[PDB]
Design an enzyme around this catalytic site. Sequence first.
Site, PDB file in Angstrom:
ATOM      1  N   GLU A  35       0.812  -1.208   0.000  1.00 27.86           N
ATOM      2  CA  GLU A  35       0.000   0.000   0.000  1.00 27.86           C
ATOM      3  C   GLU A  35       0.851   1.266   0.000  1.00 27.86           C
ATOM      4  O   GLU A  35       0.521   2.216  -0.740  1.00 27.86           O
ATOM      5  CB  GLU A  35      -0.910  -0.052   1.204  1.00 27.86           C
ATOM      6  CG  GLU A  35      -2.060  -1.028   1.141  1.00 27.86           C
ATOM      7  CD  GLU A  35      -3.140  -0.732   0.078  1.00 27.86           C
ATOM      8  OE1 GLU A  35      -3.036   0.268  -0.670  1.00 27.86           O
ATOM      9  OE2 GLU A  35      -4.065  -1.537  -0.019  1.00 27.86           O
ATOM     10  N   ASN A  46      -7.690   8.239  -5.830  1.00 25.61           N
ATOM     11  CA  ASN A  46      -8.465   7.158  -6.476  1.00 25.61           C
ATOM     12  C   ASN A  46      -9.233   7.690  -7.680  1.00 25.61           C
ATOM     13  O   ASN A  46      -9.550   8.884  -7.748  1.00 25.61           O
ATOM     14  CB  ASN A  46      -9.479   6.623  -5.435  1.00 25.61           C
ATOM     15  CG  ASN A  46      -8.778   6.061  -4.233  1.00 25.61           C
ATOM     16  OD1 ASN A  46      -7.791   5.369  -4.427  1.00 25.61           O
ATOM     17  ND2 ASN A  46      -9.213   6.414  -3.007  1.00 25.61           N
ATOM     18  N   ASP A  52      -6.430   8.045  -0.802  1.00 25.73           N
ATOM     19  CA  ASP A  52      -5.983   7.115   0.176  1.00 25.73           C
ATOM     20  C   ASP A  52      -4.800   7.727   0.949  1.00 25.73           C
ATOM     21  O   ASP A  52      -3.916   8.236   0.296  1.00 25.73           O
ATOM     22  CB  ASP A  52      -5.472   5.878  -0.528  1.00 25.73           C
ATOM     23  CG  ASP A  52      -6.610   4.951  -1.057  1.00 25.73           C
ATOM     24  OD1 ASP A  52      -7.833   5.121  -0.812  1.00 25.73           O
ATOM     25  OD2 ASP A  52      -6.204   3.948  -1.689  1.00 25.73           O
ATOM     26  N   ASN A  59      -9.053   5.241   3.003  1.00 22.08           N
ATOM     27  CA  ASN A  59      -9.756   5.944   1.950  1.00 22.08           C
ATOM     28  C   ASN A  59     -10.717   7.059   2.466  1.00 22.08           C
ATOM     29  O   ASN A  59     -11.511   6.793   3.364  1.00 22.08           O
ATOM     30  CB  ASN A  59     -10.464   4.828   1.130  1.00 22.08           C
ATOM     31  CG  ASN A  59     -11.061   5.350  -0.137  1.00 22.08           C
ATOM     32  OD1 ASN A  59     -11.119   6.511  -0.273  1.00 22.08           O
ATOM     33  ND2 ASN A  59     -11.597   4.487  -1.000  1.00 22.08           N
TER      34      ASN A  59
END
Length: 129
Positions: A35, A46, A52, A59
Amino acid sequence: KVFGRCELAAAMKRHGLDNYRGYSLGNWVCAAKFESNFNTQATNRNTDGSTDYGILQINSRWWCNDGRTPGSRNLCNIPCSALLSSDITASVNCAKKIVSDGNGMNAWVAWRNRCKGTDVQAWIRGCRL
């Protein structure tokens, strides 16, 4: 802050993620690697306009308020910027809520596609825990 692998394992274990909802620690370390590369400051937009944030790429569409994600929720009750701190408490307590919400770690795209079904124990090899 850019955590070392075992440094992060240890902070996550201290904060109670080792087998949290049945997800062994190496699951959480693997998700964090893919991540954020263990970087607390990581941010990524996103396709839907949400962003994020942090070590676990939490998120703004559901979990935090970044002041720019219309029609979103703030289910962890935090500004998204809290998720970028060198201290991972807010990310971890928020992670616990996400993973508990019925879909488990499948909430993390990178977990599902890169950690799920793999020998995640490899992510804590060598660490003093």
